[PDB]
Structure 1
């Protein structure tokens, strides 16, 4: 999700000023009416868990909603762990570990690990998965608005 580095290579760049500016304008105008969801969805396209947490933490006010969001995420992270049984660790030493709920929510994973899952073949789309949990939470919250 892309910027050119010094080596001439196209690599991931974190959620941009332009993207965040639009997100804050959407929050100011729409949080958390139903119209907020399509806008969140398009603005978070390509986002890592780290970018998603920036988005969640740039919401001013709405303390009740953001607390429901946090409850939703914690429950989905717990159910993800339950429904995706893993071995203790990778069988082959250097191989990429499978992400847990807390990796998807970005509390126990680094940006490099996130990008690693996202660009795996086949992808392990931890951004899309976290977004789904966030949209689950939004769909509960829109009832307040």
Structure 2
């Protein structure tokens, strides 16, 4: 995740193993219940797309629900791309590129790119956008049961 230190410096840290452990245990008890959503949010403050994927990867042992979630992510990512069809290059040399849907979902962007977006002034909040897609997904799974 990205944390802000006392000087206002945004600093990246790798995801906590204790965070992953708590997430797996949460899902063991509440996988199909509405509380899985605020617990996901509780455990992902400042999370990068890469963090979010690492979290999903640990609960990968659910198959059908995870397929549903991956479908919702792909849907939302398509939708992002339709609203923001990528240009051939950035506005000028030195500028970050605009994220595509797969950049937000962390499958075609590097952690360095994610950090660059998230620490922009003001933030290009790719972790929060992805979290929204994941939550929409978790919501469908709990509705479905």
TM over 0.5: yes
Tell me the C-alpha RMSD between the 2 structures: 2.8
Aligned residues: 145
Mean CA deviation greater in 31-40 or 125-134: 31-40
Q: Which moved more, 1:25-34 or 1:119-128?
A: 25-34
**What per-residue deviation string (whole Å, max 9, x for no partner) do you get for residues 77-113 of structure 1?**
1110111244321121121001100100101101010
Q: 1:8 to 1:63 in 2, by over 3 A?
A: same
**Structure 2 CA distance for partners of 1:11 and 1:88, relative to 1, 3 Å:** same
Question: How far 1:61 moved relative to its partner?
Answer: 3.0
1:10-45, Cα deviation, whole Å (9 max, x unpaired) = 721011012111111101111121111110011011
TM-score (norm 2): 0.90
Whether the 8 Å CA contact 2:86–2:100 is kept in 1: the answer is no
> Which residue of structure 1 lines up, in the alignment, with residue 61 of structure 2?
61
SS of aligned partner of 1:11: strand
The gaps in structure 2 that reach 5 residues or longer are none
Residues 2 and 48, structure 2, Cα contact 8 Å, conserved in 1: no
Deviations along 1:124-143, one digit per CA (max 9) or x if unpaired, are 00000000000000110002
Distance in 2 separating the partners of 1:136 and 1:10: 28
TM-score by length of 1: 0.90
Write out the 4+ residue segments of structure 1 that deviate beyond 6 Å after TM superposition. Answer: 3-10
Moved more, 27-36 or 48-57: 27-36
Contact 2:69–2:137 (8 Å) recurs in 1: yes
Paired position in structure 1 for 2:137: 137
